[PDB]
Every structure is written in C-alpha cells, then in structure tokens.
Amino acid sequence: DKNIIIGAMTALITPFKNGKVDEQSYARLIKRQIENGIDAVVPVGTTGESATLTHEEHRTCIEIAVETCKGTKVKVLAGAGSNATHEAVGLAKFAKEHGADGILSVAPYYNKPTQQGLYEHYKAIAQSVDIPVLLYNVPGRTGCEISTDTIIKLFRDCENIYGVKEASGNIDKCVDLLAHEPRMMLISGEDAINYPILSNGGKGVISVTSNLLPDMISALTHFALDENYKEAKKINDELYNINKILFCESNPIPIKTAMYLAGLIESLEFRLPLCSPSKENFAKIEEVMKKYKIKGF
Amino acid sequence: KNIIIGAMTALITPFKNGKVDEQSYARLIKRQIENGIDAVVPVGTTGESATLTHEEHRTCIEIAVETCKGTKVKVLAGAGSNATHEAVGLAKFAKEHGADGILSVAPYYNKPTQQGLYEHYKAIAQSVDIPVLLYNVPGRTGCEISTDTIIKLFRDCENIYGVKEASGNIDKCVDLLAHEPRMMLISGEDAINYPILSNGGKGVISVTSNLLPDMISALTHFALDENYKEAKKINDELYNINKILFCESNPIPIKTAMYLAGLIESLEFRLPLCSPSKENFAKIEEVMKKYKIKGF
Amino acid sequence: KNIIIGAMTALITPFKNGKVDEQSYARLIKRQIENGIDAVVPVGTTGESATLTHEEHRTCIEIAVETCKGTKVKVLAGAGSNATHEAVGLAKFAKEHGADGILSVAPYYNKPTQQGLYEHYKAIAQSVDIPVLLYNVPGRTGCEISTDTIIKLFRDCENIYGVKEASGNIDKCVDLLAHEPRMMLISGEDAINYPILSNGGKGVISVTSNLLPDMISALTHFALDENYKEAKKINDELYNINKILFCESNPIPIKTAMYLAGLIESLEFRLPLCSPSKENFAKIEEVMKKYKIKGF
Amino acid sequence: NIIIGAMTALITPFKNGKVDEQSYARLIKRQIENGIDAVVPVGTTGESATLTHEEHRTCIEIAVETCKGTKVKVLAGAGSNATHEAVGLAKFAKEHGADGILSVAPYYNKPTQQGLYEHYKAIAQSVDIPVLLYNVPGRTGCEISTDTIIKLFRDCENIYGVKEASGNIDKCVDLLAHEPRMMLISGEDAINYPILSNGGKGVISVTSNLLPDMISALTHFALDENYKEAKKINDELYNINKILFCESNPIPIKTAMYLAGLIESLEFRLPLCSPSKENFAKIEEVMKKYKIKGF
C-alpha cells in the first residue's frame, strides 16, 4: 500500500505581470480552485510554464501553493520534473522540505534517455525523498516514451512511485498499465479523454481545462469515481470542444488567453519562446469560451 | 435506422490445399453461434478478402447466411473494395443473397479524398436497402474517414448506421459520439473493446472471438447491460491474447492460434500472407495456455 | 542482369464517358517518346490501377507495348497486386504480350511480413524471365519492403534488378546502395529525384513527366552524365510543380494539370477518385504558368 | 560572415562527476590536427542538458582558447528552451571569443512558429556574431518550418543557415530551392553526402569525434565537387554512422571514444547512462572496420 494523490487536479497556469510572477493572483487562482471542489493543485507543470521560470521562481510558486492549501484537504503535487537528474532531485528535495504532499516528474525532454536511463533517473529521484512521486509521460513534448514495462518496474522497485500521468492519447497503453499493475494510479493528462481513462480504472486527472472550469472537471472526476458513468460521460462530451480548442496552439497559450478573456488574470503575458496566439485563434478561443459557464472568484 | 450491433466475429477463412474449406468454414460459424455471438462478418480483413477471388468471396457470404439462417445470429457481410464499382457489386450480391447488412472498408492504396470517400459510400448505400457499416482502418488503407465525413454519411444516407473503428484513437470515438450520439460505434480493435463500449459503443467486430467467442460475447453483453465492472475484468484478462494476436499482421496470429487449438486442420494462408515467425509462433502458443478454449 | 533505367513516366489513364480512352492513351505515349523519355509505365498508381478491371489493365499494357514497339522506348508494365496469384497473372500476361519488364508494387492493405514479401516477389520473379522492378510506397500500402528484403531478393532472384522508392527516406537509399551498389535504385518521388540520382540512383519513374517529360528526362540524363549542377538546377526549378501535383492524392492533380494544358479531353476519374476542389484546381493552374509545357 | 565545412559536435568527457577539462582540450587539439574546420562545444552531443550554465560556459572558453592560434572556428552551443537563458549563453559566447553560435529550437515547451521567430530574433539581436539555427524535431517536439527558417534568414543579418537533423531530404530541397543563399548544414551523419550533393556547405558531425580525418575528407571532397570520392566515404561510413545511434546520442559515441582509448572513463550524467551489453558489443564490432587516429 502506497501514499497517493488522486482525484480532480489542476495544472495551474502561472500568471505574469510585467514579466514577473504575479504572486497574489497565483494564490487567488488557487483559492478559486479550492472553492470549486478540486482535490489537488499542480504548481509549475507544463501548463505552468516550467521551462521559462527560474529555479527560484519555480520554488516560489510551490511555496505559494502549499501555503494557500494549508489547513485545507487540498494536496499540492509539485511540478518537479527536469531533463537533468541532478536538477530533478533538487526540486524533489525542496518540495519535500517545504511541505508539498507529492511531486509530478516529467520524463526528461530533449536528451532522449533510454528505458534504462529513465529507470535510473526516476529511481534516483524516488530515493531522494519519501513523498509520493507521479510519473509523467508526454512523448509529443519530450521526444521519449516511458514504456509500460519501465513504468511498472519503477512502481514495483520504488515504494513512493505510485502512478503515471498519461498524455499520449493511447488508450491501449492505459489498458496495458492497469491490466498488469492494477495497484497503480493512472492519471489522465489529456482532458478530451478524461472520461475514458477514468472508466478504465483511472483514479484522477491533472487538467488544463480546470483552470477555466474547475467545477465541471471536479464534477466529471467525482461522478466517475462514484461509478456514475452516465453523468461523467455527459460532462466529458459537453467539454469536448473546449478540451480540444485549448490546444489550437501549444498549451498553455490558449488556456491563459481564455483566463484573460474571462477576467481571471490581469495580463495576457507569456515568456518567450511562448507568445500570444494569432488574432484568428484569439477569436476561436473567445468563440468556444462563450458556450460555457465560467466561475468567478 | 435498422442496425446490427452486439458481439460480432470477423470470421477467419480456412484453406485446404489452397482452396476454401467450405465444411470447416460452416463448422467454425456454428461454433460461434453456440457461444452467444450476435453476428458474424464473413470476408473482412480477418477473412483474407484481398486474396479471395470475387467468386470465393461470394461463396463465403452464402455459407454464412445459410448457416445462420434458422438462428437469431445476423450476417454483416464483408463487402468493401478500393474500387467503387467492385464495392457496389459486392453490396448488391450480399443484399440479394440474404445478408442482413454489409461492412464496407475504406478504399485502400488509392487514397481517396474526403469528397471521394463520401461519394464512394453514397454510391454503395444507394445500391442496397440493408444497413451499411463503415469501416475505418487507416493503418492498412493509407486513408482516414474523418469524423465529419462519417457524420455526414450517417445523416445523409438512411441505411448507413455507424462505423467499425480500428484506429487506436479513443479521442476520435469521443468526438464521434459527442457530436452524433445516434450512430453505432463498433469496436474493431479487441484490446480496447471495453473503453469503446464504456463511452457508448454498441458492439465489437472481433478477431479474438474466433478463438474465445464466449468471453468476447460475455464482455460485450456485460457492457451493454452497464455492468462495466464485469466488462472491464474480462477486457483486462483478455489483454495478453488480444495483443499477441497482433504480434504479426492479422490474421496470421489468429489462424495460427486456431490451428494450435485444433479448430482448423492446417495453417494455410494465401500469399503474400504466410505462417508467422517461429519466435512469434512460440509466443502465441504460450499465451493461449492461459485461456480456456471452447471446442465444437 | 538485364535492366530498364533512365527517365520513365508513370502514365495517367485518361477516361472518356467512364471508359478507357485508348486513342488518347496512345497519343500521350507518343508525346512521351518524342520528349526524350526512356521508358513508360502503364497502369501504375498514377494510372489508377485499382479502379481498372483486369481486362482494362491488360489493354493499357498492350497499347503501350504496340505504341513503343518500333522505338527504343521500353515498356515497364504495371503488374502489382496485393494478391500474389493476381500479380503473377499480370506478370505472365505482360511477358506474353511483349512487355520489356514489370513494375510490381508491394501488397497493399493486407500488410504481409518481410517473409511474405520475399515469397510474394520470388513467386512473381520466377513466373517470368523479364526484368522485375520492386516498388516501395509505404504511405499507400501500409507496409514497407525492408532494405534486407530488397537486397535478398536482388541476390536470390536473377531478374529482380532494383526498386522504385517512394518513401521519402534518403537514409534508406544510402543503406541500399552502400550494401548493394549493383542494384538499380529508382526514384518514385519527383521532388527528390536529384538527391536519389546523385547518390547513385539510375533513373526515375515520374508523375511530373506526364506534363513535363522534357525537363524530367533532361534532369535524369544530366545526372547520369554526372553533370550534377545541371540536374540539381532543374530539380530545384521543378520543386513547386513537383509538390503542387500532390495537393490532393495522385493522380488527381496530374490529370487536372493535363486537362488544363489541353492534353486530355475530359477531367474524369473513377470513384473513389474524383475531381479536385475548385481551390486546388486554381492552385495547379496558378503553378502551371511558371513552366514551359510541351504540346502534342 | 559564416562558419561552414567539416565541424565536430564535441563530446564532453566526465571524470568523477566533473568535466575533465584537460581531456576536453586534448580532444579538441586532436580535431584540429585532423583537418576539422570548426568545433561545436556543448551541443546535444556534448550533454548540454546536464551541464550547469557555469560548466557550459567553461567548455566554451576552453574551445575558444584551444583554437585561438589556429584556423579552426568555435561555433558555440548556445541553445535553450527559455529565450532569456538562450540570450545569456549567446552574449557569453560573443563576449568570450566564440566565432558564432549554434542555437537549437526550444524543446519541451513547443512554441508556435511566431514564437520560434521571436525567440531567434531576440537571440540574433543580442550579439553581432553569426547564428546557425538547429532543427531536430525528434528531440524538441517542434519543427522550425521552412517558411520560418527562410524569414529568419532574410530578416536577420547574422542568421546564416540551419543545421538540419530531421531525416527529411525533401525539406533540404525545399529550403535550398527557395533560398539557396543559406548555409544548410548536415546534422545527420548517415546522410552527410546527400545533403552536400544538394548544396549543403558543411556538417556538424557526431562521427567526427571518433573519425575526424574521414569526415573532413568527405566534406572537402564534396565541397571540391569530387562527389565520387565523397560518396565513397559516405558509403564506407554508413555502418558506424548508424551504429552510433543504436541508442540515443551521445551514448554510443562516448562508448566508442572510451573503447578507443580517447577518454579515460565511460561516464555520463543521468538521465544518460551506459548502453546495453548487447549494443556495447555491436559498437565494438563496427569500430574494428575503421582506423581510429590517436593524439
């Protein structure tokens, strides 16, 4: 039996104001997540622009998430991934010592480690701390794939590695994982297919869409865990169009644009190489947003 | 719309000395019927459509119809082609010879546009008045029937009622049923039968059911009964055989497994298909042991 | 090892009122001959092999043979099929009716293994005594003839002399000619004709040459003369027309282009192939204005 | 100005976890003595991801100082997926004597074409040395489209070409048919000759770490339009060129260097590690077909 972080989770956006992390806005957005039934938040994942933050800013967002969730049931699953194991270890230890409840750790991007290397990477991380570690597979961004064999071996050799966030659009893989290792927590990292992953025994989502519609994502997720599949599928079907349009340009470009258009953040700011969407996609995002009910603060 | 749904088997076609073993074909079909299968699909990809002549294709349809005649089991006849005149000819034969419906694969090799796909299927649909199921398998055809095309055909042609999806794309299944929840989405990919049914799919056209018809039919009927727990359990237990049956191109592994089970007399294909590599042969034999294979 | 190499044209098949326009077919071939082409390829992918009947296919081969008879232009007949018995039949017909060699596409749709591909081509190569050229186009067929398999066939079969590559994989072309520099590698991809030739390829089987036979054959011969500057220059100039001819699936744009140029009477295909969109019709027409197109 | 010809994506040797600086210098001298035109410190092959910014800076200084009294140029690895980090590296390389920079497309965060354009524009405007774009979609999860490369070439004076490692010869044709003024550089050893025969003007090689004499000969034969001799060497090199990617680069090349006695220890920084026993033997077998120059 392992310690786990599951349920509806939000891959938090990181709002910028004048190039700087807007810390008060960050906390406010987290409280809005908490108030709308979210079970955990993920500071500084892909959606949080982990690549363009400094290590110090990355750490600051984690503290803000811990502090804001303190005295609530909401857990902090801190973004702690890196393509350098020594950097990933550093983030894990910080997350550990500053009260994060677990870490999300993306597969190394760019340097394309072998399955053996991925094993050693995660093993080194998992042994550096005693908090839950969620693996994170997203081959379209990293250029590598953590195989099912490798994921299962890590779950079985490391006590704190408890599951994987899958963003590979491969439901066959999801069946493979849970058929051979039914003990692991399979987490959806692809909004459009939240329901199918939950209906196969997935235990949560780490969502982009929940930044905008946290009430609907947590409802979907909780319906599924309660085996009310008709209601979970209904929301998933409703959410399909926005779930897709939030990726008309690379995430987090559309979600931030949507949060801006909704009046949830003050400034539509990115750090290069990320930038505003074309005026066309701006209109498309405005188009889909208007078809949903968006919570305020 | 009239439909054919539930648990269906994409029947293998047994050869003896290069010729279609008619008696064995009929016996294999009776075995499917006795194990609670709802429909059989003669001459699909699994039935080696490519290497049968038009005469043998027609004969296989006839045996299927006649074998299922006095039963509740329906015949969804394999009727696709990459040439529209051939496909229409097949469709009209199937209609006139007692098939309950037709399965019609997307044209392979010639890569039609979406407009061409539309006209292809519209031509087929207007040639018969029995249900037509579309069939998407881009990994084999080199073309994809898009979601929009599928939906237009479903809405424009009364007898077109759904699609067999073999694309390994659960996102598309969600896309399909969220925009047109009236269509019958049929699983053409055994390993993910359950996920497709749990999103509102209404049946399977299965390779694995040639070997394990009772388990595939049970899986499907649990799902249709909203007993997802039982359906998922079976889908998980079947994952090993489901995948190993595609260690080489279908239907190489399934015919190999049917042979190892003693269900067919000879492991015979028509070129360019041939028996599997000996490594894969052993993998198939080892996996089969985990399962209980019904006899005749 | 007898070979057919140089500048070759994958001939379009003109239709008039649903039928093969045989007079127009012969006229287009004579145009090819008169513009420096070394060989024509009747009924390949470009020739809509999939929608022709076997009788129509055989007719087109005979017309090409007859038209080329008294010239030095060779007929490399399209004789491919996804069914080995069909491909053997086409191969034998081609030999018996005066074809100089055969092109034989890899089996589409049924995805045979490398072992299956070996036996498929070995059967074909042993059925006749004329040169056989292999044809790799994985985007259309869904299978790939591995370098190892191509090389075995080249070494095991006397009359198999090379491959037409339409895979966009220059790495593979390096692999082939590094390990077997005796085989004839043929470009089946116009846009990269020059890079394939400059690595030691000995010809092309072209779509573009239907419209611009003089430029393609000049390119090829410049390359064979090791005048690489001149070959690359033509290749770069042709890049735009080479790409626009694939804005929709081949041969939809090439036939549209021939119609625009006044080279065929009607813009007819056979379903599932159809007319291009007005937009793509305009793109092709726009691009065509940059090039000198040979008359009748 | 431009930096072209035969170039080497330098491996970075480690000893006891630390960059072996003396070994790094000897390896560069060895490249210089074997006819190489330029070296590329800290590219993908040099484990850019796992070096700290400080160590990355040190490797650049060593390359510049080692090359200083020679004709060999230093094209400094200066890429990043964060534009601010990339501008920092670019400025450092300029200020510390680099002749130009190599800048890989942002990895992981997948910028749009507009973002890639602004990324490189910000970099190009920060220094007045040549910049070579670097496209490797299989590693970065994004591609610099032909249009974007061409706009950057045309809009930015010091952006002069692209290292292409995308296994797409159609792209190479596209690029040079529309903009033949750019320096297309091969970043894929197996197809060095095809890229050069199409108007490419150099290579940035993995294989040249082990066999610099052969890579520089191939490149110079090609540049002198002796395609016969260039293809001959490209063909001879095919086995080693492929085997050096039997596992992710630079895992096989470092293994090869170690087996050859060109580096002291087979040491990577996680998440990179030693190859499987099976691939270790394969690499060892292929190496026996080639003559490896010493120091």
Ligand SMILES: NCCCC[C@@](N)(CC[C@](N)(CCCCN)C(=O)O)C(=O)O
């Ligand atoms: N189901 C029985 C018929 C099999 C026919 C065929 N082997 C070939 C189909 C064909 N359209 C025939 C063209 C023959 C003339 N070139 C094709 O090969 O594309 C196929 O459909 O795979």
Ligand SMILES: NCCCC[C@@](N)(CC[C@](N)(CCCCN)C(=O)O)C(=O)O
């Ligand atoms: N004035 C010169 C006549 C040359 C004849 C022919 N066109 C071939 C004609 C041929 N296809 C040959 C068939 C024999 C193949 N070994 C034919 O006679 O039909 C050629 O070889 O180029």
Ligand SMILES: NCCCC[C@@](N)(CC[C@](N)(CCCCN)C(=O)O)C(=O)O
């Ligand atoms: N979340 C805060 C840290 C961000 C760091 C970095 N931008 C780059 C990481 C790095 N390993 C740094 C290498 C520096 C020396 N070249 C990389 O660029 O790969 C990333 O991980 O995306």
Ligand SMILES: NCCCC[C@@](N)(CC[C@](N)(CCCCN)C(=O)O)C(=O)O
């Ligand atoms: N005695 C003649 C040697 C020439 C020096 C240098 N190695 C490079 C020079 C440089 N790297 C600085 C060049 C600045 C580039 N814009 C150096 O001074 O070390 C070269 O030009 O090749």
